């Protein structure tokens, strides 16, 4: 009743939903506390992060820095691969990825620079080529500079600066912190007080208003005690702004409008401590003596309730919720509460490899000087136990264990952790993300599924700026760990692999482990011996893939692994529309190529092992449905490749031209055509047969080459093209070209006679 | 090891060890990498028995190129660290990425030399890279001349204030002696570079550079009014070793085309 590709498409749809059901942060950080860690040595194949390279500060910057009379400062523009150094009233930028960078100097400023930041521009203000705004704060004024960070052939942005005539006098309040919103709003704070200022700017000059203005959103008055800021933090997904004070007070501001900022929550350390005391587990790691050293916003895409992480100097991660009084009038919260605490790990870093209650007393992260959190929970903590050497604790969610945990009430904040040692003299200054923000889904459920996106986005990389250079730290995926572990099993026994494989099964489950083996066998992780590793991965896929069984059947873990891998290769495509109507393609062509290559390498792997992999060759009811299921998946793979080739062919022509000369029903069918329908549903095939029948018609009008477009459609997308149609196309070729040559007398009798043949 | 080789007249083997070490990712400072390369260069320039002239020259050449780039990198690092207008925060960062393995000329230009407006070093970089781009080269020459002029002007001003009783801006080391006129400091910059690149470079296209310097002299009154020799631009390039025929040849072109300031009287 239901054909192969439609059966396999059913497996894909159910697999997509399974990946998108990965637990949300609120669900495994429920009210309470946790100390769950599995620590890994930094040199281990199981390390969750590792240093990939380092970039020294240019010598010319050292010359300027040691030529500093009063004040110097370093900072990071990790979004574009740039660092900067300020010396008194002078500023120097440079691309730290470049092996011998040139210094972009800016010395117009008259007074000492106290803060520098790179923010988005205000829309409709600057030319489109301006990608950022550079904010330079001195003791006398704030200065805006236009920035164009266009990528270069080498892979590092080319940076050019533009003047703006936009500037404002600072005033009496120091500026040490500058943050920007998605829409280009610029907020300021510093070490004089807790006031928050905003800089406005516009293109037009007016007689009643300048191009650039500044206002104090705090409206202070009367008696005020000493208190100032330690940092500012933005969350665009909630239109919120957070400040942290030197007294560890957390203030929340809501952007109720494009020019408004309203304080809506103020929570001092006493309030946090009172919440903490009402929890079941109180600890001497958090008292009235403890300081909060850093905040990190948690976006609404990641979690609904938990808004904010706060790091104590004892290494405790405080996770705070925020809630509005009502459900309708963005809606501003009015309350904030400490709900969940992740306590520090216990293992300390060691040169030599050392050998179930809540651990709420560890001093391993005491003192924590700096801290950072990146979605889906990557945590960097600068521990400063000694005044000369920083130690870096880095941890990630144990995505594999969180995904397998059952039932939901057993979910805990499991983590994989490691210690990265920096050499003597390295003082960490800042840590920033160099790759695109992580997101496996568009809502909390599914958001943190690292496993699902292993092959859709590069692993996260982080630039660690020190006083001596920039270190690049990279997140390691399961396939990276699996490949590395197998690389150590190349010189060992049959039982050595089985032992290493059992470690993975106990953490990730059998399906995820076999899917990793399949991926490694197909060359994933090799963008980083390699033939032996891929052959070991093949051996693991065969030997430990399981088998089908009667419970309706339960297919092998080998089958589920193939379905899981294939689904994740096309997850960005499946439910997406093919086109966007001036019609264009929803998915960039470059992305369609890589997806197709991945699908084809998977197909090539199955063909080269059709004889050794169970279920591929034909075989009692169990192995029967195993063969049918595997067959259906392989038919979907070839259909996926044909479908992608068809879309690429389509946009190589002039689709808008083809779309114009088309009937309404077929325009509408093409309007809401998804990749799933193209791959697995007859209407996509029928519509594909219409489009090919239409593109060739147009190709003949351009008349570049018919027989080349023929052999293009004949072979690659065969089984969807028909050989009786190309001969027809060859006939309509001479017919139209007989109408092209129509004025000629002797040339047609050969065109029309051959068209008739 | 290298000391053993050399005393045994095995200079090429030592040059090989030293070069590889200079290119390696071991923890070696830039200055030590400069010493290693400089030694390899010497050791590869002399005969080592049993080894072909071709193999010697190729190593001596790789060491010479890497040594040239290394010296550039060292000039940068030093200048940046000492630069009063660079924030301390940045300097530490510069020292980390420049006081280690030798970087590519692209990086040195883009991330450091161009950002800090060290145009003289930019020019040395265009030389080491065989950079074929007359327009950019001249743009850099124009920036170097103007930058140097403004700096000389500033220093003469400070001096004039000392000799009049006034006070200099906070944190300005006075000049106890008449600093050089701007055209003297500019030509100093041109000499330093010339000696470093040897006039045979593409950063000394006399047909473009001589008119620009002459242009500068006119448009900034670097002439008799201030007690300078009106022919100073010509003296400069002649002593520098530009052949007489080429000079006159260019000057002819200047006179025939009547461009920029070379017009009217």
């Amino acid at each position: 009743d239901l054909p192969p590709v439609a059966k396999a498409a059913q497996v894909v749809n159910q697999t997509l939903q399974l990946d998108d059901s990965y637990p949300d942060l609120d669900s495994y950080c429920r009210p309470g506390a946790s100390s769950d860690y599995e620590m890994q040595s930094s040199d281990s194949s199981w390390a969750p992060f590792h240093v990939v390279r380092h970039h020294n500060i240019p010598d010319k910057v050292f010359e300027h820095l040691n030529a500093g009379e009063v004040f110097t400062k370093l900072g990071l523009f990790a979004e574009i691969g740039y660092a900067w150094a300020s010396i008194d009233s002078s500023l120097f930028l440079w691309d730290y990825t470049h092996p011998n960078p040139e210094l972009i100097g800016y010395e117009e400023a008259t007074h000492t620079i106290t803060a520098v930041a790179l923010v988005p521009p205000k829309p409709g203000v600057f030319v489109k080529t301006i990608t950022h705004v550079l904010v330079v704060a001195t003791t006398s004024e704030i200065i805006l500079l236009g920035v164009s960070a266009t990528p270069t052939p080498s892979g590092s942005k080319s940076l050019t600066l533009y003047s703006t005539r936009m500037s404002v006098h600072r005033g009496g309040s120091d500026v040490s912190f500058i943050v920007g919103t998605k829409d280009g709003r610029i907020f300021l704070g510093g070490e004089s007080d807790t006031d928050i200022h905003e800089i406005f700017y516009q293109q037009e000059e007016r007689w009643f208003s300048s191009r650039c203005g500044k206002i104090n959103h705090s409206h202070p008055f009367g008696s005020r005690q000493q208190e100032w800021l330690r940092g500012l933090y933005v969350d665009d997904t909630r239109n919120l702004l957070y400040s942290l004070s030197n007294r560890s007070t957390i203030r929340t501001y809501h952007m109720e409008g494009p020019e408004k900022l309203t304080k809506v929550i103020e929570k001092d350390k006493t309030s946090c401590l009172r919440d903490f005391a009402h929890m079941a587990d109180s600890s001497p790691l958090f008292t009235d003596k403890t300081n909060i050293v850093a905040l990190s916003p948690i976006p609404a895409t990641e979690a609904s309730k938990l808004h904010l992480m706060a790091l104590t100097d004892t290494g405790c991660r405080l996770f705070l919720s925020a809630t509005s009084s009502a459900s309708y009038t963005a809606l501003a919260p009015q309350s904030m509460q400490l709900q969940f605490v992740k306590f520090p790990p216990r293992e300390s870093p060691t040169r030599i490899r050392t050998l179930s209650q809540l651990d709420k007393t560890s001093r391993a992260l005491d003192p924590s000087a700096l801290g950072f959190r990146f979605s889906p929970g990557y945590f960097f903590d600068v521990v400063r136990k000694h005044p000369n050497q920083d130690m870096l604790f880095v941890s990630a969610p144990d995505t594999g264990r969180i995904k397998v945990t059952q039932p939901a009430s057993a979910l805990k904040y499991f983590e994989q952790g490691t210690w990265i040692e920096l050499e003597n003299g390295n003082r960490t200054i800042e840590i920033g993300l160099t790759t695109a923000p992580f997101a496996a889904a568009k809502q909390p459920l599914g958001f943190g599924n690292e496993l699902a996106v292993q092959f859709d986005q590069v692993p996260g990389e982080f630039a660690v700026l020190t006083n001596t250079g920039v270190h690049i730290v990279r997140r390691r995926r399961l396939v990276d760990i699996f490949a590395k572990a197998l690389g150590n099993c190349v010189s060992a026994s049959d039982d050595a692999l089985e032992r290493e494989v059992r470690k993975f099964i106990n953490q990730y489950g059998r399906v995820e482990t076999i899917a990793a083996a399949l991926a490694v066998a197909c060359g994933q992780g090799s963008d980083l011996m390699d033939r032996n590793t891929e052959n070991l991965a093949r051996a693991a896929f065969i030997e430990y893939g399981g088998q089908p069984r009667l419970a309706s059947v339960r297919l092998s873990s080998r089958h589920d692994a193939l379905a899981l891998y294939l689904t994740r290769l096309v997850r960005t495509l499946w439910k997406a529309k093919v086109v966007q109507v001036d019609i264009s393609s929803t998915i960039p062509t470059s992305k369609l190529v890589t997806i197709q290559e991945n699908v084809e390498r998977l197909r090539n792997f199955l063909e080269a092992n059709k004889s050794t992999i169970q279920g591929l060759a034909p075989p009692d009811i169990a192995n029967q449905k195993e063969h049918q299921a595997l067959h259906a998946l392989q038919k979907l793979m070839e259909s996926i490749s044909e479908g992608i080739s068809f879309v690429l062919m389509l946009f190589d022509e002039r689709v808008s031209d083809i779309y114009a000369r088309l009937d309404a029903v077929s325009q509408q069918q093409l309007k809401d055509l998804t990749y799933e329908q193209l791959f697995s549903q007859t209407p996509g095939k029928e519509l594909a047969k219409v489009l090919v029948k239409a593109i060739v018609n147009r190709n003949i009008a351009s008349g570049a080459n018919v027989e080349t477009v023929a052999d293009a459609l004949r072979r690659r997308c065969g089984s969807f093209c028909s050989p009786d149609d190309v001969v027809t196309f060859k006939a309509q070729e001479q017919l139209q070209r007989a109408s092209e040559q129509a004025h000629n007398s002797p040339v047609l009798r050969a065109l029309l006679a051959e068209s008739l043949r | 090891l290298c000391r053993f080789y050399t005393t045994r007249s095995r200079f090429f083997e030592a040059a090989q060890v030293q070069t590889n070490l200079a290119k390696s990712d071991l923890n070696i400072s830039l200055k030590d990498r400069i010493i290693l390369l400089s030694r390899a260069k010497g050791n590869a320039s002399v005969n080592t028995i049993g080894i072909s002239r071709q193999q010697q020259q190729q190593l001596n050449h790789e060491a010479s190129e890497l040594l040239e780039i290394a010296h550039i990198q060292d000039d940068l690092l030093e200048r940046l660290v000492a630069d009063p207008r660079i924030p301390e925060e940045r300097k530490a960062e510069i020292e980390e990425f420049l006081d280690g393995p030798i970087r590519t000329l692209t990086d040195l230009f883009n991330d450091y030399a161009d950002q800090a407006n060290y145009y003289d070093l930019c020019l040395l970089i265009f030389h080491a890279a065989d950079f074929h781009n007359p327009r950019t080269i001249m743009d850099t020459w124009n920036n170097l001349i103007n930058q140097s002029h403004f700096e000389a002007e500033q220093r003469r001003e400070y001096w004039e204030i000392v000799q009049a009783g006034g006070d200099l801006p906070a944190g300005v080391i006075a000049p106890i002696a008449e600093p050089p006129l701007p055209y003297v400091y500019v030509s100093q910059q041109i000499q330093l570079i010339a000696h470093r690149t040897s006039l045979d470079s593409l950063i000394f296209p006399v047909n473009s550079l001589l008119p620009v310097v002459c242009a500068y002299a006119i448009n900034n009154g670097q002439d008799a009014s201030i007690g300078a020799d009106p022919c100073w631009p010509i003296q400069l390039f002649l002593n520098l070793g530009v052949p007489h025929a080429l000079m006159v040849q260019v000057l002819e072109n200047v006179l025939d085309t009547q461009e920029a300031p070379f017009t009217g009287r």
Binding site: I80, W84, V116, A137, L145, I178, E430 | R103
Partner: peptide
């Protein structure tokens, strides 16, 4: 590297503190 690659597109502002 003795090969130059100009890329004004995406640099790091030399005249600002870091994010």
């Amino acid at each position: 590297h003795k090969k130059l690659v100009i890329n004004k597109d995406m640099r790091t502002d030399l005249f600002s503190p870091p994010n």
